Design a binder for this molecule. Structure first.
Ligand SMILES: O=C1N=C(O)NC(=O)[C@@]1(c1ccccc1)N1CCC(CCO)CC1
Ligand SMILES: [Ca+2]
Ligand SMILES: [Ca+2]
Ligand SMILES: [Zn+2]
Ligand SMILES: [Zn+2]
Length: 158
């Protein structure tokens, strides 16, 4: 069970996607981290300089980590289990259409799912859980962590 030994973690947005404004990308990420924060003792702090626990970036095909992206559709992003260096980091496929609406693909939703991986959660078998191994849009306004996911982080961090 790889998990963070610390509760205050830092994250850093290394690059942005041209598809949305910087503020939009930052808002999506912030909201995505908040989902998890309200159900655990984890506190996330955004940094702009230096080394952060969770590095977030948009990359194309080969990007230096044994898991190149596949272009439009297919895998949308990937994250690393809690750990030093690359651990906890999340990479988003730069070739995907990134949105903040119902159109594929909503960044807030994909990001929330990736952060679950970054936190140590595995995939869930419950089709209504954020951690279910498939992307499906759900109303983002006032969206909150589903029941199963709350049980998930809870089981790890309390
Ligand atoms: O389950 C996933 N888990 C990821 O970490 N990354 C993905 O892209 C993932 C994902 C799921 C949900 C949200 C974000 C990402 N997913 C997207 C849909 C795809 C379906 C191929 O038909 C299977 C891999
Ligand atoms: Ca892809
Ligand atoms: Ca890291
Ligand atoms: Zn990667
Ligand atoms: Zn996943």
């Amino acid at each position: 069970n790889p998990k963070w030994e610390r509760t205050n973690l830092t994250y850093r947005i290394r690059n942005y996607t041209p598809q949305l404004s910087e503020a939009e990308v930052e808002r999506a990420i912030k909201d995505a981290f908040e989902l998890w924060s309200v159900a655990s003792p984890l506190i996330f702090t955004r940094i702009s300089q230096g080394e952060a626990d969770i590095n977030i970036a948009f990359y194309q095909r080969d990007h230096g980590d044994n898991s190149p992206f596949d272009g439009p559709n297919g895998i949308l992003a990937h994250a690393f289990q809690p750990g030093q260096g690359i651990g906890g980091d999340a990479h988003f496929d730069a070739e995907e259409t990134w949105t903040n609406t119902s159109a594929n693909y909503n960044l807030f939703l994909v990001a929330a799912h990736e952060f679950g991986h970054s936190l140590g959660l595995a995939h869930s078998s419950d089709p209504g859980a954020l951690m279910y191994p498939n992307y499906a849009f759900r109303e983002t306004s006032n969206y909150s962590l589903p029941q199963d996911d709350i049980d998930g982080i809870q089981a790890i961090y309390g």
